[PDB]
Design a protein around this ligand. Structure first.
Ligand code: FAD
Length: 147
């Protein structure tokens, strides 16, 4: 996984999201003080390319343990979840809903059981919205996590 050398336009993307003409889920106002991440949809397995301070702190994982990985790792108390595996602590329907929404560039909002680095179980009120890069086409996905 590689990252944009100059960094990501997180604030620009936040504004883009709040300005979206056809919102499908209720986000309301959000900013960089929250736990959020940006994944690259044009790279293998939609890797995380940006994680806010709040996300790292809320989950207990460091930047080096988050960047370049699919966020599904939060689905196991040991931070290890293989793609297509049948999770034993997370509802399959919820996981499937997330997968199809991403594949369709459709907004989605769910409550999913996740685990912190120390293994603590928590419910993640998660919202994901597709983001267009400078080309005007969808390239990234911004996720908003809330314990
Ligand atoms: C920006 C962003 C932020 C994210 N943040 C989080 C986060 O904070 N926490 C989190 O947990 N995830 C998060 N995700 C989601 C995660 O990265 C994956 O997208 C999610 O787990 C679903 O995709 P998958 O690849 O894991 O699917 P898969 O590994 O393919 O798993 C799908 C599961 O659903 C079941 N299933 C599939 N199809 C069907 C069907 N037709 N009928 C019945 N069952 C079916 C299967 O049994 C399977 O185990 C985020 C994603 C993005 C893009």
């Amino acid at each position: 996984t590689l990252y944009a050398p100059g960094g990501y336009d997180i604030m620009g993307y936040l504004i883009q999201i709040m300005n979206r003409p056809n919102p499908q889920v209720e986000l309301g106002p959000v900013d960089t003080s929250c736990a959020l991440i940006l994944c690259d949809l044009k790279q293998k397995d939609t890797p995380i390319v940006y994680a806010s301070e709040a996300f790292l702190y809320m989950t207990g994982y460091s930047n080096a343990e988050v960047l370049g990985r699919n966020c599904r790792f939060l689905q196991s108390p040991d931070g290890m979840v293989k793609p297509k595996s049948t999770r034993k602590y997370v509802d399959s329907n919820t996981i499937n809903t997330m997968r199809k929404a991403i594949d369709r560039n459709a907004e989605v909002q769910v409550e999913v059981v996740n685990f912190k680095k120390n293994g603590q179980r928590f419910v993640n009120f998660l919202t994901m919205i597709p983001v267009r890069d400078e080309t005007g086409e969808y390239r990234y996905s911004m996720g908003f996590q809330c314990e």
